Amino acid sequence: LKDGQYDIAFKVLKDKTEEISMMNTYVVSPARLTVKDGKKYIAMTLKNSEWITKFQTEKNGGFADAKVVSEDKAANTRVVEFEANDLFAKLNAKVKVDIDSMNYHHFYDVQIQFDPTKI
Ligand code: HEM
Ligand SMILES: [Zn+2]
């Protein structure tokens, strides 16, 4: 594909499975793919932002916090940005969730699967 901005559908999968993750409820698909100089960046909206305290994706054999490129405090959402390579390969990610009022404090591994062909 060539430089520009595109819609890309995706699903978040439970770690090491083809099952839909509980996290899938809290992301917006499609995400936005920016292609720039042969590199691919994904901008993804997280819902219930206040609950999601960390979000990381695999980068160079390690995990890195995705950049927050915008926040909407009124909507309680935010947009995070990270690099993808092969849009047909699963991307490993990590999430930390904290809901003080429900005593829910966990962190998880998940996979993101993009589907470039989907509309
Ligand atoms: C808000 C109320 C929430 C409740 C009641 C809840 C409940 C649960 C429960 C019971 C499980 C065990 C597996 C299952 O039953 O499906 C689970 C796992 C999991 N939850 Fe939560 N959760 C909540 C919020 C969130 C949020 C905001 C995220 C954002 C990432 C999240 C991500 C996950 C992940 C990644 C797992 C591991 C299994 C999977 O990937 O589906 N959850 N959750
Ligand atoms: Zn846990």
Residues framing ligand 1 (Cβ under 6 A): 14, 21-23, 26, 48, 51-52, 95, 97, 99, 104, 108, 110
Contact partners, residue 69, CB within 8 Å, separation at least 6: 43, 79, 80, 81
Listed residues: CB within 5 A of ion ligand 2: 106
Q: Which residue has the tokens 């490129």?
A: 69
**Which residues pair with residue 39 across a beta bridge?**
36
| Residue in 52, 62, 61, 64 with CA at minimum distance from that of residue 104 | 52
Cα 3 to middle of ligand 2, angstroms:
40
Q: What is the resolution of this structure in A?
A: 1.7
Domains belonging to the chain, first-starting first, are 1-119 (2.60.40.1850)
| Residue in 52, 32, 51 with CA at minimum distance from that of residue 40 | 32
Exposed/middle/buried for residue 66 (C-beta within 10 Å: 0-12, 13-18, 19+): buried
Query: Which CA distances in Å does 116 have to 9, 33, 64, 108?
Result: 7, 10, 24, 25
Where is the chain discontinuous (C–N over 2.5 Å), named by the preceding residue? Answer: none
Pocket test for ligand 1, best of 18, 22, 47, 113 (most atoms within 8 A of CB): 22
Cβ(99)–Cβ(105) under 8 Å? yes
| Residue in 111, 13, 103 with CA at minimum distance from that of residue 58 | 111
Binding residues for Zn(2+): 106
Write out the DSSP string of the chain.
--SEEEEEEEEEEETTSSSBPGGGGGB-SSEEEEEETTEEEEEEEESSGGGEEEEEEEETTEEEEPEEEEEETTTTEEEEEEEES-TTS-EEEEEEEEEGGGTEEEEEEEEEEEETT--
CA 84/CA 57 separation, integer angstroms: 9
In the PDB record, what is the listed experimental method? X-ray
Torsion over CA: 25, 98, 16, 6 (sign) = positive
Cβ(64)–Cβ(77) under 8 Å? no
